Symmetry: C5
Subunit: 307 residues, 5 copies
């Protein structure tokens, strides 16, 4: 069992794809294991850069292939390097940019708790062992929070476990097990933009739609309600175009639905008030006075929902 | 005829392209056939990783090229590996991400039954035989259903058949036939988002468009109907922008068309009511009382259509 | 002059880009020419797969480079293979996906007659001759027509010609001429989606815009006409966003323009009716009765245009 | 100083990016210089195709690297070829597709005069000389003009100059100078689509906005003006979505601004007419009669602007 | 410690991605260090072009890998060249296009002060020293300012520093330190397009929304206010579609919010005026006369905000 020390440097996280549940990571990966002592030019360690590494591999140098389990496609590998010390240790350093996968729940969307994971694991080697994992996130989490889209909470996280693959080749007994490094980074979305540019005017619009009951004539009350409907549709459009695509409804979508339902309910009451009648036209006092009931009645449901 | 055992591990299915009828698959492929016994270092099997495999092929090692028939372009091949046992068996393991093709009917779109297929088959070898196919979909179908976009039903499916190519080279008689592995996975789309964020408010809008008959003045009835038309167009826009592009109409599109037709019909009746007349202005009782007939008359067609 | 037999298998055609006049083709290409007899292992023909082909070329094996003339960029070349028979024939088989160019007229757009062309021709060799071209389109043209976006008419088409390049190097006399294979596939667009989801509601909207003349008050007639204008703009938007981008106007765009012109004309008549007058207000009978003339007067132009 | 004859064949120009000031070119490049006589197989010139060229370079064959100065990124290089004549001449032929840069002024946008430039120049060689440049644009400029987006005027253009680089290595005196080929192609945009589908209905809308003064009641005049404002915004949207993105205003944008300004001015006059008054309500005759002044007053500015 | 002289030529800066905080740079990089004297053919320096450089590296020629620290992915490397002088100096010249990262604050967006940075640094070598950095931005900053999107202020900027990496391998004492070149270019966005096509009509719209108080009837005042709301939503859409996506609100977004708030406030006052009353209907003089207060009251906040 060969001991391998992994260090991962995270430069940037970006390009979140909500539909594909995918996010981009750029950084460095460093792997250090101790092999057989060697004779370098002078005593000083040897530096082997990109194209030459292959040449060394062809001469029988041993370089385990480490795979990102949760990666999508194949990473963009930048400059890579081998460092060979005379005392036998070997240090592989490479730069990568890759698209990674993980389970992501956006149902809370404006206010989101997401976590970005990297899963590393040897491709072909069951007994080679990951000694320890060190993650340098040092690119500052809090410098400007309201600039960066996501606010990163705490410094990384680490797990080194043994994954067992049940379905395998003819020889079971001693190796189903591969060592896996899991690095998770917790992050929270910045609600500002969505609160001010979406939630707020949406609220204003809903509240304003309640003002239909302060109209005098029935005709006015109806004809206006249609304009309201149109406004909600237009808003639904404005949101849907900018907002990220999802298989499910977010909080904002629910607000929109609440808008539609509020207006349709208003329509029903407005028509009901007219044709529930003394002779044919009598309009209900308390009902036309629902201008108080409707806003809080909505607010009741509003306070009930997140709860 | 060489026996080849194939195992395919499906990690993720995503990136469905409705227009191109294409979907992305990420996973592993494992091929195992038994060759001539060999002498490995020690007794233990030999592990040959990525770049080295080519070197082994150049030395006369035999590695059949397996082709995905239904793939689009060429797959993104990750880490690949050969495992050479002294008793002669050879196991090829590779990681891939690829875009695959298949016939897809979206006419039911909000509620969709689709099936994702992989078609494997040797490129150049007519007699080499696929022994058996095993598909590990083990990445959990039901864990969170309402998170994942598609709900996968059952565990995979398998067929191993012999495909005959009629048009071929000068020598017909014994080999037109190649062994083909076909893996199909049945899946059903999650209607939630579309029901709540599309179907529902669309319904509310249609129903509301029926309220035009509860207006008193002819002018009101018309002028309002135009606002309704506008609203339906705006909605058609909001849907069309978000929804996937298709060569054909879905259920929702039909609903939209139903909206247009309902409103235009309403216009016709509204004008007809005015100018079918006692003197010139007489409005038809039963017709202005169509407020009952129109909703169910639509509903009749609605219940007739899916039927 | 070397005789070369080409067979092309078309798997899929897709990704039409209207602006770039480009379309994607995936399939196989097979080239067969007869060289000098060879000694294979056993008698059986030799199979040389991807990476090895280059190695054979470096040993002086002759492999003409065939170029797609109308290709854009360079194709995605999948698995490729050489088959070497002892009697001297050589068969090159490769899989490709590529973007191809051709002249495309979309002026009829909803109903389109387009043709997809492949142009093959030796890169460096003036005397090497393409014996015959065979195109297997066998992937079924008619299975489900209303699923596939394009309906393919007939089985392919073929031409083998000699192209002469006037401008050339210092030596003219005997070779300006290269053999070119041209494969054309005629296809017709499926109008369904565009008829129902675009043409139809657009028509309904136009017809409805004629109902403005059934209004009583001048004010109503005007104020409504503006809402109509807005509706046409909104519709123009909804179409333009979904529909493919073009340098020219399609049929639908013309319909839109017809809408604008109809409404503006309506405005002119509505204002004219008011201020062409007995004293100042007199409205013209026949003119307010143009509710008959306008629809057919439009229809006249409509029946005149395609004609 | 080595004489090099360059011939460039332009197949297609497309993919204009207004923001990046970039355009795509596909074609062939041919370079011919005369080296030392050689012994070919037979007397006939030698054909060296793609992969082999490198092999020849490694044997000390001399192949100058020609760089496109104005290219963006690196070109997609298709099939390439060397032709070696026994009398010593060498002809390099390659196919390329590349994104090129040039200064582009879109301020006139609907009617545009643009020019597409290619700048070629040896990478490392100060004394090697470009003998002459020949550009075959022969792909027909005028066949169908209203199909192609751009109308190409005249056949190419050519310049061969000497560029001097001031800032250089330690040795100045005799070589700051590299030979540069510049190929420019003048082209004019097709205004049709923009005239009919944009300019025209925009005009109709503006003209129609002048009809607000033919309304009787002040309320009507205002309430309608708002609908007009909305219509102009909607139109601004429809244009902005389809039209290419720019750092500056085009002609159409100016028209839009003119729309806004016209309507706001109308608002100001409408309110002014009401509250500039005999008692409080008196409306100005000449002002309500500005229905004549406003259209030409706008037209005055319109005829003044391009002038 | 090897002295390395770097010169960087900036051709173009473009493709700013606001969300990813990324921008494209195209140009040349030149690195000059003095090695061991060599014997060239003749006395004249040797020119080694693209593919050959690798061959020289394989023979033990030393070519430090320089990394762009702030690059995203890996650059598109064009033609590259080595120049070997007999006196031992070596000059590496390469052309590159790459996407680079940097902190970008768009909160001021229409008027933006941004700075484009390049960070260069040896990949594997702690003692090799960057002698000096020279940046040729010579592509003209001021030629046409209103054409180019960004106005570049001053000629570049330069820093050469020593970066210390705390976390490292087992040997600390003398080398934590790598030499880093930092090149920063200050630029300011061109407000024209946004002022005229966005800020201005937005202002006109706001001002116009104040005209609601000049209406007589309460009904008019309300029903109109809704149309205003719709107009602001439509405008919010038109802006949001064209404008760049951000995690935060810009100035324009704030203006939009101000619009919504202004209209909602107007609604509140309009309803309050009606139902704060003598009997039930009395409308407040000063309140209906707020037509003066509202515009400046807004303007007060407007002048307070940037301040
Ligand atoms: Ba790479
Ligand atoms: Ba790959
Ligand atoms: Ba099919
Ligand atoms: Ba899962
Ligand atoms: Ba490939
Ligand atoms: Ba879009
Ligand atoms: Ba290439
Ligand atoms: Ba042509
Ligand atoms: Ba050598
Ligand atoms: Ba390169
Ligand atoms: Ba930062
Ligand atoms: Ba320039």
């Amino acid at each position: 069992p060969v001991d391998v020390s992994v260090s991962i440097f995270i430069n940037k996280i970006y390009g979140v794809n909500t539909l594909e549940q995918t996010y981009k990571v750029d950084g460095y990966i460093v792997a250090q294991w101790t092999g057989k002592p060697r004779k370098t030019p002078g005593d000083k360690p040897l530096i082997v850069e990109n194209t030459q590494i292959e040449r060394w591999i062809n001469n029988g140098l041993w370089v385990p292939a480490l795979e990102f389990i949760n990666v999508v496609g194949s990473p963009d590998t930048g400059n890579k390097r081998l460092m060979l010390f005379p005392d036998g240790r070997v240090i592989y350093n490479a730069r990568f940019l890759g698209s990674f996968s993980n389970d992501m729940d956006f149902r809370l969307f404006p206010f989101d708790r997401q976590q970005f994971v990297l899963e590393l694991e040897p491709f072909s080697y069951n007994n080679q062992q990951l000694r320890f994992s060190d993650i340098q996130v040092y690119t500052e989490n809090i410098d400007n929070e309201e600039i960066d889209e996501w606010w990163i909470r705490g410094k990384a996280s680490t797990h080194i476990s043994d994954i067992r693959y049940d379905h395998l080749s003819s020889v079971q007994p001693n190796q189903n097990e591969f060592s896996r490094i899991t690095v998770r980074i917790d992050a929270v979305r910045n609600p500002s933009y969505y609160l001010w540019s979406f939630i707020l005017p949406l609220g204003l619009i809903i509240a304003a739609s309640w003002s239909v009951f302060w109209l005098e004539s029935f005709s006015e009350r109806l004809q206006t309600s249609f304009t309201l409907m149109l406004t909600v549709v237009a808003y639904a459009f404005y949101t849907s175009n900018i907002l990220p695509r999802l298989p499910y409804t977010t909080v904002i979508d629910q607000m929109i639905i609440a808008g539609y339902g509020s207006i349709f309910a208003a329509i029903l009451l407005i028509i009901f008030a007219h044709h529930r009648q003394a002779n044919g036209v009598e309009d209900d006092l308390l009902i036309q006075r629902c201008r108080l009931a409707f806003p809080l009645g909505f607010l009741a449901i509003g306070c009930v929902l997140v709860i």
